[PDB]
């Protein structure tokens, strides 16, 4: 019955597949078509055609493993896409049409139906599979009767009858929010359209509207740009992705139903884009510190994941108007064009998405200007993102506190992310591939960059924890200067350290004090563990003298500096130790498999060479202090360290501060309320984090109390001398 429901489904088909936009003469589209042709060909030649078959596909035969249901139905969706693509060799193919119909019936009779109960993961039963079934039926609605459609979607209503909750049939349902809430729309709104059920459509859309509300606690988007999911996990880059990616797909359809969403309600999406997503995108890469356990997926490295966000933004731009549309187009354009490592089209999986991107890139009317400098203090999720446009580098600071979980290990994914939030830092430079090409399965998980840890063995079976202290946070002064601290205690309460960071425009100072260890394990801070490029080798200098690193760790006592020299200055990394320090370095090939950190991944061996720099802490009360200076050549680095000779103001158990004389900026962390006199110019009076700038006789102050998550009146925390 061709009606308004089918009309909406046609629009949905144009969004999830886009066959109406296909053009064989379009190289990028032809590439995706060829991929789908191959997938269908593989599925058709391996499917079971035997009577009394115990499965459709032998590699997805054990139906007690929920993942096999979703994978099976997704193969049918691929078939539906091609059978309805005039340019496919499978267009209106009678064998494929019958294969999809027969397969749906077979699964319905022996594997997935209303009489079944969740076996394995609820996600496959309520989201993964229902979405694959909805899309298959939507694409091939001209081959199924309304009665068959309702028949094959009854199971969806059994497992997901309530648009406000998931796991309804289990003994522990949960309130649907964020990404999950968006998926609820792709499940019940589409099923509602297929079943011509107005009540399901309306109630689901109404439920979906909750997603536009910013929160001040719990899961969701925060005013400061943070995004929390799974109770207390920083998750903008994975569940946030699903949210914007899926919602941007749904909106065009929803807005054409009898229950469109108010325009002022959808206004918050622009806040997510500018405040939440944009800062986490550097040279086409979505910062891993925001991706949770997804970092352990080989097919979802940083640049790939970024496309999920970018395509979502582009769709939103397409449904926007005027300046709003123009600026969003420019944002997507400059990000994509800044990415010289990853081909955006590799993750644009529908013809409309491919088409939109091509028009954007070729439209001279859409400005593509390098993004300006910025610094986002995502205090509500304990992460900080910094980007310097003049020099061209990004910096990510990954922390956690009593308010957030350090790392997520679940569904057998991210088994070794133990220290990824223990004050771990990321540097985004000229090597756009650094955190890609197998970084995650080859990086030594015991030496994450920036972290202070003991060398005790850790179990893959462990799960995340919150930090005992709430004294973790960032005080931002402007787009280039901020200060952060973390009152760190390790996983088993055997080591402590007051770790602080001083972001000073074109460099970051790392200070650590009060380092104590009550265990028999050795303690050390990993200054860096950088993945190398065989094509661009580094020439290493210690105290400005070339050094030859080996697989075997070499000690360098009385080190004032270390410089990693590339042929490309935008890949250079220098480390200046305020006080001569005893460090050790090594360059070695590290091997591993994605399966080591994610059970469902390939056991194929991967290898990468890493340069590791560490500083041992053999005594209680130890400390570390150094300045990370990227993107400058050797002579310039040498000149800068002389300018910074006296930049360290203090680094003890109650006070840590660094001064940038060139900028007239101070970064300060106070652990108590004593009166601290700084540079004989002013005094800071309260426990907390400060970033201060002197402009003549004037003083600009940025104070933050991380525990109460509040700033304070200037006179309460600052006092100029005389
Ligand atoms: C955010 C997240 O990790 N969600 C998990 C699922 O992963 C997303 O799957 C899809 C999709 O449209 O199916 C798009 C995203 O890129 C993925 O991040 C999925 O995990 S997995 O199978 O991809 O490894 C399901 C499986 O049960 O679990 C979700 O939590």
Curated annotation (Swiss-Prot):
Identify its membrane topology class.
Peptidoglycan-anchor
Q: In UniProt terms, what is the effect of altering residue 180 to A?
A: Almost complete loss of activity
E.C. number(s) listed in UniProt: 4.2.2.1
Annotated Gene Ontology cellular component terms: extracellular region
Impact when changing residue 74 to V: Retains 67% of wild-type activity
The protein's superkingdom reads: Bacteria
Which GO terms label this protein's molecular function in UniProt?
carbohydrate binding; hyaluronate lyase activity
Which keywords fit this entry according to its UniProt record?
A: Cell wall, Lyase, Peptidoglycan-anchor, Secreted, Signal
Active site per UniProt: 180, 230, 239
Where is it mostly found? secreted
Catalysed reactions, semicolon-separated: [hyaluronan](n) = n 3-(4-deoxy-beta-D-gluc-4-enuronosyl)-N-acetyl-D-glucosamine + H2O
Q: What is the effect of changing residue 411 to G?
A: Slightly increased activity
Which family does this protein fall into?
A: Belongs to the polysaccharide lyase 8 family.
What is the recorded name of this protein? Hyaluronate lyase
Instruction: Supply the source organism for this entry.
Output: Streptococcus pneumoniae serotype 4 (strain ATCC BAA-334 / TIGR4)
Specify first residue, last residue and whole-protein length for the fragment.
Answer: 287 to 1008 of 1066
